[PDB]
Amino acid sequence: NADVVFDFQNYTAKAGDEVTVDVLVDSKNKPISAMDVKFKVDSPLTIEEIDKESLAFNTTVMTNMAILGANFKSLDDKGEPLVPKDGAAVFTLYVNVPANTPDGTYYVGFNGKNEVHKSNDGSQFTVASKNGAITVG
Amino acid sequence: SVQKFPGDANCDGIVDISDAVLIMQTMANPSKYQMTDKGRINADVTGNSDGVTVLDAQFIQSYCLGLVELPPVE
Ligand SMILES: [Ca+2]
Ligand SMILES: [Ca+2]
């Protein structure tokens, strides 16, 4: 069973809407030192922007929109890895639903990179994800 | 001489965001967190051999995102 589980949450939209996706995490109150991830969404939806703040960790997220990549370090003022703030977005994504999107369910999630680091030595947690359904009607 | 491995602050044989974490920690609490002599050499990746600062940690983050290249091995 995964050490930490991301909840992309579920959303409803109509064609033409922007959806704000708040990605939550449950680490079972374990601390996390850093994340380095990539995102995707089912076509024809697009991720238009990755927010540069992580509310769960009160830190700046570095992004590369060309690969939908994002990373950060999550340490307190003495360098200790942080427990994520319960209920707070770890990442926020802004998703565009084009005007001509057919009715359907379109998933947002990770795209083959989802690193969650434990410490300072390369050790990582195992990771799972759930939800991320954007139901367009 | 032993060839350096630019980016590999923690000397685990790969460059990834844990290297940025170690850099930050060594400045936040030097009593608790240190780099080895090799790690410190490895960690200075930008700034023209100015020493290790937060900009080195950020450069490793950029590298993990595909935005920059690490400096030459010596
Ligand atoms: Ca390393
Ligand atoms: Ca430097």
Numbering used by the authors:
A (entry chain A): 5 to 141
B (entry chain B): 23 to 96
What did the publication describing this PDB structure actually write?
Cellulosomes are sophisticated multi-enzymatic nanomachines produced by anaerobes to effectively deconstruct plant structural carbohydrates. Cellulosome assembly involves the binding of enzyme-borne dockerins (Doc) to repeated cohesin (Coh) modules located in a non-catalytic scaffoldin. R. flavefaciens Docs have been organized into six groups based on primary structure homology. This classification was recently found to be functionally relevant, with the binding of group 1 Docs to the Cohs of scaffoldins ScaA and ScaB providing the major mechanism for cellulosome assembly in R. flavefaciens. The data revealed that group 1 Docs display a conserved mechanism of Coh recognition involving a single-binding mode.
The RfCohScaB3-Doc1a structure includes a single copy of the heterodimer in the asymmetric unit, as well as 323 water molecules, with RfDoc1a coordinating two calcium ions. The complex displays an elongated shape with overall dimensions of 40 × 35 × 66 Å and includes residues 5–141 of RfCohScaB3 and residues 23–96 of RfDoc1a from R. flavefaciens FD-1. The structure of RfCohScaB3, whether unbound or in complex with RfDoc1a, was essentially identical (rmsd ~0.37 Å). Thus, RfDoc1a establishes an extra hydrogen bond between Tyr-55 Oη (Phe-55 in RfDoc1b) and Oδ2 of RfCohScaB3 Glu-84. In addition, the side chains of Leu-87/Leu-95 of RfDoc1a/RfDoc1b occupy the hydrophobic pocket created by Gly-73/Gly-74, Ile-71/Ile-72 and the aliphatic portion of Met-66/Met-67 of RfCohScaB3/RfCohScaA Cohs. The closer proximity of the two protein partners at the C-terminus of helix-3 in RfCohScaB3-Doc1a protein complex allows the formation of two extra hydrogen bonds between RfDoc1a and RfCohScaB3 that are absent in RfCohScaA-Doc1b. The data revealed that alanine substitutions of RfDoc1a residues Ile-39 and Val-43 resulted in ~100-fold reduction in affinity of the Doc for the RfCohScaB3. Complete abolition of Coh recognition resulted from the substitution of these two non-polar residues simultaneously. Overall the data suggest that the residues that mostly influence RfCohScaB3-Doc1a interaction are Ile-39 and Val-43 at helix-1 of RfDoc1a and Ala-38 and Leu-79 located at the flat surface of RfCohScaB3 8-3-6-5 β-sheet. Inspection of the RfCohScaB3-Doc1a structure revealed that the symmetry-related residues to Ile-39 and Val-43 (amino acids that occupy the equivalent position to Ile-39 and Val-43 when the Doc has been rotated 180°) are, respectively, Val-76 and Gln-80. While the side chain of Val-76 and Ile-39 are compatible, the bulky polar side chain of Gln-80 would be incompatible with the hydrophobic pocket in the cognate Coh that interacts with Val-43.
